[PDB]
Subunit: 337 residues, 4 copies
């Protein structure tokens, strides 16, 4: 008896989730899609031979009682709207980042879920299902390196478009680190501070690139985090955690080594999409399985999406100030531990 899923937002990553659920995972199907370009969410239904109803809007989709779960995977701001609706409609919502564009918007969503008595919100912070990050998590839980003291990490991308702006670096990009990092160390962030190095020749004039970002936590962990999205050479994610008695570090994507013309190479990816393909799969599948065999969602909480929003805000605030901004977090509700 499979899980009936409605996708709100048949975009490019909305299309990747539809294709994975259709042709790759187990125990779910797409029965309902709405888009704001109604013709596109009608191109998608034909393209993946779906048996789905095309709604003009989220409301008429959440209306349908066929659907017990929605993928929210449209624009960055048109999320908070759709999520809040689906919480009251008593459906299961998987929400792609961001949870909502504003810190309070996340808070309004937390409050709703608290009422509704059980977890229906999973935030699409896929890094927690990547095997690399799980091994890291594993070791830290086992105290392998003892108490964590520093973290060094990088999020690098070959080039970006004309539509890519100085804040997107802390909003669209550094956001995943922001999630995965505190997940790992089990601490709350206590201050951000941006620092701009020399501007890159590959960066457009309207964009500040690269940029370091330093983050203290309550415990005393210090994290410097490089974001450079015009690095030209590849898409590359790096994370090294120094602890009291040792160091653990994230792996490279598996590659065949080559020996040719003087050099001993491995391979570096160019397409951000390709880097996490398998964590997407594991992540959705866990949404499904966690529902059919538990009656609630499992992954990153709606609260975790709030911490992202607060800290993303702290960042963009230090981006234009050059100062050491703060991260104030409202008390963690009992509903969450």
């Amino acid at each position: 008896m499979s899980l009936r899923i409605g996708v709100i937002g048949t975009g490019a990553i909305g299309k990747e989730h539809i294709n994975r659920i259709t042709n790759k995972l187990s125990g779910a199907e797409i029965v309902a899609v709405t888009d704001v370009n109604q013709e596109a969410a009608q191109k998608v239904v034909e393209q993946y031979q779906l048996n789905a109803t095309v709604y003009p809007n989220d409301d008429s989709l959440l209306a349908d009682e066929n659907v017990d779960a929605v993928l929210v995977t449209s624009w960055g701001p048109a999320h908070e709207s759709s999520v809040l609706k689906a919480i009251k409609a008593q459906k299961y919502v998987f929400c792609e980042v961001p949870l909502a564009t504003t810190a309070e918007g996340c808070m309004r969503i937390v409050e709703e879920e608290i009422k509704v008595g059980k977890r229906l919100v999973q935030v699409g912070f896929m890094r927690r299902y990547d095997s690399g990050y799980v091994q890291l998590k594993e070791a830290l839980d086992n105290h392998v390196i003892g108490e964590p003291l520093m973290i060094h990490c990088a999020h690098r991308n070959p080039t970006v478009g004309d539509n890519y702006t100085t804040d997107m670096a802390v909003v669209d990009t550094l956001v995943h680190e922001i999630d995965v990092l505190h997940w790992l160390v089990n601490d709350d962030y206590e201050s951000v501070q941006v620092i701009y190095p020399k501007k890159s020749k590959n960066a457009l004039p309207h964009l500040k690139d690269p940029q370091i970002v330093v983050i203290e936590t309550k415990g005393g962990i210090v994290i410097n985090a490089e974001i450079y999205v015009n690095c030209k050479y590849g898409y590359d994610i790096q994370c090294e955690i120094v602890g009291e008695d040792g160091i653990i570090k994230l792996p490279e994507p598996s590659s065949i080594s080559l020996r040719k013309e003087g050099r001993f190479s491995t391979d570096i990816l160019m397409d951000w999409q390709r880097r996490f393909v398998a964590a997407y799969d594991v992540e959705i599948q866990d949404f499904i399985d966690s529902i059919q065999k538990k009656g609630e969602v499992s992954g990153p909480t709606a609260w975790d999406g709030y911490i992202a929003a607060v800290t993303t805000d702290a960042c963009v605030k230090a981006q234009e100030s050059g100062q050491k901004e703060k991260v104030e977090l409202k008390e963690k509700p009992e509903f969450y531990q």
Copy 2:
């Protein structure tokens, strides 16, 4: 409209395929299982909450017209029997290695499939779906290193049981290399030759371990291949292909690096099962998808299973002779290219 699958042989790897098809892949279900220990193939139906009929034997299972595909995943010799039946019953057969224990048994199976006009036989040589081996394949197809000249490889295992015998090394074990190697280089084997090094202290008395194995091909490619199944340190697969202008080499399983107490370590697996978990998944899924969207199977042919059998035989013949045995292969039928 899903694919209805009958598993003949609810063993330990029969159980892994059932669990993957049930809870991990898309577009198939298990409706029919038979085992020779009828109570075990009744423990399995309860354990994975299946909706399946428990048959006393293959015949009564192939009888059922619910099932259009069988997993043959029981004993090593009780394969040739079940496969040949399912070819005449006009079902789709996925067969775990070996195809059949004897070289002619593979030949009897080829002849049957040739009649039946289309490919219904996929042999479970999973290495072709491991991302490592695909990258290797990719590079060779692109002539990256030019013409292949030598191959060095190893199949190593921590320890083995009392039931593990000197021939199983070339039959159960070196068999995958034997498949994947000629797949890659696109050549037929022309001679084997075993060579025994000093016996290991970890090997039991009744077993010869390690052993090198040298294989020429028609083209002139030379392959030495180490098999050491009491290596004690881990399960480890290595393959390096030297060519005219360069060298390509298989990767290590992804690992987090650690720095602690003098050493800079990564991690090595202990459980042969864990090494290929993802190629199993991709492999089954491709059986399914290749059927529902093509009306035939895709992967390794029944012919490829024959080449395994001939060459496995050539080996065990050189195992007890100490001589340079030959590999004679009947002409490749037009039905196959």
Copy 3:
């Protein structure tokens, strides 16, 4: 016709230079040693079978006209005294770090050398002769990665003594990075800023360990630099330079890899002395050779020692202030380019 060398300061590193010059390098000998513990200098002359005169003090040694070059390898704050003397005595001075303990003390030494018309001062910043750092230098000079934008680096040590204090971290330790880094990028430092993470359990109570240190340059290069001297696992130097179009990174000390008990290890050094043994050798030898075939010294200038002093000061100033200190450098004298 060999080079006649006087060692002022027959300490433990004074002794290593004496042993290398005696039994390892070419074209020089020790003919004169003074120490402040006069008995230790006589026991040294006997230990390495030298043909040398034991002076009571630097002055009587610089007096001797046998000697045309001195190694100053005495207790730290003793350097400025001895160097200034040897500049007026018109000898060649090789000075171990620091050049002098105070920024102006370096300035007094610069002014003296400017008068004396030729370079007689080489500062013992050996990192410039390590093959790793030379390869880095090479690449940057060839614009391989284009314009440098960031640098990440680490200086880690297993444990330290009771005599090791919170400033020694920026004075004895981070000092080599401070030299080698601006050498590489060809830029002057423009600001330091210390940041203290959680204190380590391996650090004594009187010591702040670890600590990050952030350094901007004039050009815009940003450098974070970790110093952790109770890291427990080994002695380890790391330096990664990110540029506009690529990344270059320093190597590990050569090691044999091992496969044993689950892990795939290389080796990490424990003794800070062992890490640079071969740069010391190359460095002294270049002092010698550069003299006998040029009539002046070659390596790091007395000026470069001044930049270390200014910047070392900037650091210890930001160490106790928690603020973003500045690095003001007097104009580079024409005598130096």
Copy 4:
């Protein structure tokens, strides 16, 4: 009081030893050189500003009582002549490989040294002084991986000249492995067997390239050894030793890693000379030091040179026969352990 050294054979490697002893090592000088092109030896004495006598022949040089040690660095088949002379002249001989071109020629040289009562012969098998091979040696001596069972290794070179012939592969080239390998495992060779793979496009027509070479020892260790001297990509030495409980493997030459245009490279050498530069240095220096402080030579014995000769012969015998040749070794003289 330095060591007075006569070089017989002022060739290209004769010249490298002269330059190292003159300008790089400690406690020795060149006072006497002879060459068969007498004009080349006079031009050498001028080039390196030596204080040396130019003899017309070895005899008149060994005549001189100034010299107490000779480097024999002359054309290959010229060695046996000069060495035997210098043994009777009672001088110290450092002999570059080969010791002598024929197996009995080595035997004649062993017999002479046995009479003369002390070791004056050091064979120039430098691999024993390379830090890699020393680490390997170290581990094996400590039983890290337990009992050695197999060895895989490779000697690869970019391209060779027109003067490079199918036997030089086992004579000039595989000879160093032949020495270093039995040194390491502490065993005598018991059989060789050549095997030719597909001929390379980079190899000239008159040369068979690559070639495998399989060597059993008495103990049961099996060694396959690849020689490919037109591999085109670099000069590359690889050696992996598999043992009962683990695997140890030789390192790569230290390199800076680069990230650029899709790839994560290190560097591979092109010039065979550059690979061992530091083992040459350590090797000569140990000749010197071992003499001045022991009154005999230390390194590889004249016996070890004989084992190379026997085994080199065994190989070239299996090179043209395609058969499994044998290695018969006369009893090891008590003079040698």
